[PDB]
Enzyme design. Structure first.
Site, PDB file in Angstrom:
ATOM      1  N   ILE A  14       0.822  -1.151  -0.010  1.00 17.92           N
ATOM      2  CA  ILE A  14       0.129  -0.079  -0.006  1.00 17.92           C
ATOM      3  C   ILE A  14       0.841   1.289  -0.187  1.00 17.92           C
ATOM      4  CG2 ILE A  14      -1.750  -1.332   1.221  1.00 17.92           C
ATOM      5  CD1 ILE A  14      -1.026   0.127   3.552  1.00 17.92           C
ATOM      6  N   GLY A  15       2.351   1.148   0.161  1.00 15.85           N
ATOM      7  CA  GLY A  15       2.946   2.240  -0.032  1.00 15.85           C
ATOM      8  C   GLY A  15       4.381   1.906   0.031  1.00 15.85           C
ATOM      9  N   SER A  16       5.344   2.850  -0.245  1.00 13.46           N
ATOM     10  CA  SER A  16       6.808   2.598  -0.456  1.00 13.46           C
ATOM     11  C   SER A  16       7.639   3.843  -0.128  1.00 13.46           C
ATOM     12  CB  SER A  16       7.261   1.943  -1.700  1.00 13.46           C
ATOM     13  OG  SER A  16       8.742   2.099  -1.930  1.00 13.46           O
ATOM     14  N   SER A  18      11.579   5.916   1.707  1.00 19.35           N
ATOM     15  CA  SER A  18      12.900   5.816   1.697  1.00 19.35           C
ATOM     16  C   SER A  18      13.205   4.728   2.757  1.00 19.35           C
ATOM     17  CB  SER A  18      13.585   7.171   2.078  1.00 19.35           C
ATOM     18  OG  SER A  18      13.013   7.938   1.123  1.00 19.35           O
ATOM     19  N   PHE A  19      12.129   4.492   3.759  1.00 19.44           N
ATOM     20  CA  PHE A  19      12.510   3.859   5.196  1.00 19.44           C
ATOM     21  C   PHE A  19      11.838   2.289   5.044  1.00 19.44           C
ATOM     22  CE2 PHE A  19      15.106   6.896   7.011  1.00 19.44           C
ATOM     23  CZ  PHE A  19      14.489   8.222   6.628  1.00 19.44           C
ATOM     24  N   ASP A  21       8.703  -0.428   2.873  1.00 19.48           N
ATOM     25  CA  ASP A  21       7.530  -0.621   2.062  1.00 19.48           C
ATOM     26  C   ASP A  21       6.306  -0.958   3.344  1.00 19.48           C
ATOM     27  OD1 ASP A  21       8.982  -0.569  -0.380  1.00 19.48           O
ATOM     28  OD2 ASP A  21       9.352  -2.693  -0.132  1.00 19.48           O
ATOM     29  N   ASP A 127       9.656  15.680   8.986  1.00 20.37           N
ATOM     30  CA  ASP A 127       8.956  15.283   7.436  1.00 20.37           C
ATOM     31  C   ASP A 127       7.596  15.383   7.685  1.00 20.37           C
ATOM     32  OD1 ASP A 127       9.044  14.468   5.191  1.00 20.37           O
ATOM     33  OD2 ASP A 127       9.062  12.281   5.525  1.00 20.37           O
TER      34      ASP A 127
END
Lengths: 289, 7
Positions: A14-16, A18-19, A21, A127
């Site tokens: 459902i997402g990826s 830099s830290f 998936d 962030d």
């Protein structure tokens, strides 16, 4: 079947970031859907276990997701989290990239408070962006949560409250679109930068886009240059043209904070609380969606 | 422009 922690069945991605998936998961014990964050154990600098320690230090705070499991399995460090609802970016897109002033102000109040809570626990987030705020599930659908502590860090000693030292010559940390002006100048992040970023998030919600968004570049190193230049060349008063002065007042306040200064979280909330009343809105939890 | 960047 494939189950991380012997307990959570792995679902679709459902997402990826830099830290790691993010995947949907299902707790076989309860059928509870969860979010499963995976980070490759070969990662340059492992980060998920540190992120998990931050989440544990923040547990119980309003709008902080609960962590269900943390361990190493196979080629991954694993962090299983309570599944929340859509992100504010998801909802912004769902709403055709228009939010009413009322929704912006309802959100602003809670987002200021979420950032204040993190700061109260001696960390800065670094962030702040719409993707990193999610609404709660069902009954908790009225509550804004904050996620993604992969760039978070301590800004003061827990016992002495000695602030981290000032420094320059830093590389950009965070996201280019929402970073503070001082971050583009290479300055160490502190409390003020989380709030300045929030100010850009709020004007993004008002405008549908920011003026330094979607710039044509070539290298990603020169991408940042064009963004930094436009962000610096756009006065706050021009950015906020067509919208209530409170949004410019908010941003000017954040830019005027000194590096180690405690932000006046109450002053900032009251700016947009006074506007909310002037508008005749009621705090009835009716968002645009 | 929206990728999470580190130091």
């Amino acid at each position: 079947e494939l189950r991380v922690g012997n307990r959570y069945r792995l679902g679709r991605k459902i997402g990826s970031g830099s830290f790691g998936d993010i995947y949907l998961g299902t707790d076989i014990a309860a059928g509870e859907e969860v979010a499963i964050k995976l980070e490759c154990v070969k990662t340059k600098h492992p980060q998920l276990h540190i992120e998990s320690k931050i989440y544990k230090m923040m547990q119980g705070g309003v709008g902080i997701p609960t962590i269900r499991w943390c361990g190493a399995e196979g080629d991954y460090n694993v962090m299983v989290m309570e599944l929340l609802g859509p992100s504010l970016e998801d909802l912004f897109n769902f709403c055709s990239r228009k939010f009413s002033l009322k929704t912006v102000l309802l959100l602003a109040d809670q987002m200021i408070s979420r950032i204040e809570y993190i700061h109260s626990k001696n960390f800065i987030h670094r962030d702040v962006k719409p993707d990193n705020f999610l609404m709660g599930l069902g009954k908790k659908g009225n509550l804004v949560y904050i996620i993604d502590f992969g760039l978070a860090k301590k800004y003061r000693d827990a016992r002495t409250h000695q602030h981290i030292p000032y420094r320059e010559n830093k590389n950009l940390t965070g996201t280019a679109r929402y970073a503070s002006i001082n971050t583009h100048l290479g300055i160490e992040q502190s409390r003020r930068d989380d709030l300045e970023s929030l100010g850009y998030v709020l004007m993004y919600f008002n405008l549908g886009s920011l003026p330094w968004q979607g710039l044509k570049a070539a290298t990603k190193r020169q991408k940042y240059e064009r963004i930094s230049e436009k962000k610096m060349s756009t006065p706050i008063e021009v950015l906020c043209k067509g919208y209530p002065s409170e949004f410019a007042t908010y941003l000017n306040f954040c830019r005027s904070l000194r590096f180690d200064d405690k932000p006046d979280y109450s002053y900032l909330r009251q700016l947009f609380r006074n506007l909310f009343h002037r508008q005749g809105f009621s705090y009835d939890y009716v968002f645009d969606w | 422009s929206v990728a999470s960047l580190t130091s």
